[PDB]
Design a protein around this ligand. Structure first.
Ligand SMILES: [Fe+2]
Length: 186
């Protein structure tokens, strides 16, 4: 019963429709992103890796309503524990596997941060998070293979917080793009 995009281009077109209004049906977006069968012939132009850290590669600016990007995780690469600046966040596997670790939010007190959930995102699976769900950290499960994920944020945001797992203290972080529309950035 779910609308199945046949290409990454179909998916983008559907997303433009589902985010045209004021109401976002989270479960419907998630199902449609999941239904798209990752095809590396369609997204290899965005798959630009770096040796030391994961890269963020803008695919579509979603008419200001959302950002759609591809994240490329080298061998062993992982993220910090971060929030999502009051946005919706969808992340779909395109290649390999990510481990998502969900954390509880810290208090004012300093303390080791608490894990609320731990899972591996399967092939083509679409996960969802926002700040009310919790914080998370995401990482390539593999030290011999890369991972590639498709992320949708609505509204778009260019800053978030990184969290120290030992204390819960946080720092503001400005996120950058490694490339946009297949073109490397400065
Ligand atoms: Fe995230």
């Amino acid at each position: 019963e779910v609308l199945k995009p046949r290409t990454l281009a179909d998916l983008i077109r559907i997303l433009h429709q589902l985010f045209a209004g004021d109401e976002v049906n989270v479960e419907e977006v998630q199902a449609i992103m999941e239904a798209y069968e990752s095809d590396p012939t369609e997204w290899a132009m965005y798959a630009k890796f770096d040796q030391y850290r994961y890269t963020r590669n803008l695919v579509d600016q979603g008419n200001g309503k959302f950002n759609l990007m591809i994240l490329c995780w080298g061998e062993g690469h992982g993220s910090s524990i971060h929030d999502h600046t009051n946005s919706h966040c969808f992340l779909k596997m395109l290649q390999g596997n990510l481990k998502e670790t969900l954390f509880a939010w810290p208090d004012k007190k300093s303390n080791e941060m608490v894990k609320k959930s731990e899972r591996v995102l399967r092939e083509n699976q679409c996960a969802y998070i926002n700040d009310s769900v919790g914080l998370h950290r995401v990482e390539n499960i593999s030290h011999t293979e890369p991972a590639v994920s498709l992320h949708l944020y609505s509204p778009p945001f260019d800053t978030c917080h990184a969290f120290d797992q030992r204390t819960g203290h946080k720092n503001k972080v400005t996120m950058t793009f490694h490339s946009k529309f297949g073109i490397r950035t400065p």
